Amino acid sequence: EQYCAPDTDIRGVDAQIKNYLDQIKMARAKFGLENKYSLKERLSTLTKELNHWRKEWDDIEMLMFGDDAHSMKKMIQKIDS
Amino acid sequence: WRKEWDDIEMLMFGDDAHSMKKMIQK
Amino acid sequence: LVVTRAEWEKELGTDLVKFLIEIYDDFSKGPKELESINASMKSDIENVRQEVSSYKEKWLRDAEIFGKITSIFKEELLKRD
């Protein structure tokens, strides 16, 4: 709206626009540059978490391995006969 | 009988894997 | 691909400066849009931290399982005898 103001000089308003456009670039750039990168660090943390989940699943498997071993003991009592 | 012996061997292998698992837990 | 001139650190943040020191980054999305996702992306990073805590809890459960696995381990040491 300042362009059509009565006493305004065009040069100054053009200068304001350049500063404004540059400020737009900087805020958007900072947010985007963080978003992905910080999120990528979080994703590496998530891959570590998935490895931990795999370890938990392996512990569950060892327990189920124990169940299998108990079933095997019952079976041995059975080639005993 | 051979299958039963193989199952016993697999149990021994699992016990071996058990030590590696304890090492990982440490 | 401009120069932050410590200003990049002043706005993006000092700590991040590590990787981007060791520009040409995307700015295609609207800064309002980027601000909204970064709220949500930060929320997702918090969710990832919560998931890491859950994985640690899973590891503790696995450790309780390992302590029962410990009697079996003692029997195995006796067998190795």
Author numbering:
A (entry chain J): 158 to 238
B (entry chain C): 210 to 235
C (entry chain I): 148 to 169, 191 to 249
Q: What is written in the article reporting this PDB entry?
A:
After iterative-rounds of particle sorting and refinements, the reconstruction revealed the presence of an asymmetric dimer, with a well-ordered protomer resolved to a resolution of 3.7 Å and a more flexible protomer with a resolution spread of 3.8–7 Å, referred to as rigid and flexible protomers, respectively. The density of the flexible protomer was interpreted using the structure of the rigid protomer. Maximum-likelihood variance analysis of the cryo-EM data revealed that the significant nonuniform distribution of resolution resulted from the remarkable dynamic character of this assembly: the two protomers swivel with respect to each other, alternating the opening and closing of each side of the homodimer (referred to as proximal and distal sides). In the THO homodimer, the two Tho2-Hpr1 platforms are arranged in an antiparallel fashion, i.e. the ‘head’ of one protomer faces the ‘body’ of the other. The major homodimerization interface in the THO complex is mediated by Mft1-Thp2. The tips of the C-terminal coiled-coil portions of the Mft1-Thp2 pairs intersect at the vertex of the chevron forming a hydrophobic dimerization core. An additional smaller homodimerization interface is mediated by the N-terminal helices of the two Tex1 molecules. These two homodimerization interfaces appear to be the pivot point around which the rest of the Mft1-Thp2 coiled coils and the attached Tho2-Hpr1 platforms swing with a seesaw-like movement. In the THO-Sub2 cryo-EM reconstruction, the Sub2 protomer at the proximal side of the homodimer adopts an intermediate semi-closed conformation, similar to that observed in other DEAD-box proteins in the activated state, rationalizing the Sub2 ATPase-activating properties of THO. Thus, in our cryo-EM reconstruction of a THO complex in a resting state (e.g. without substrate or energy source), one Sub2 is kept in an activated conformation at the proximal side and the other Sub2 is in a flexible conformation at the distal site.
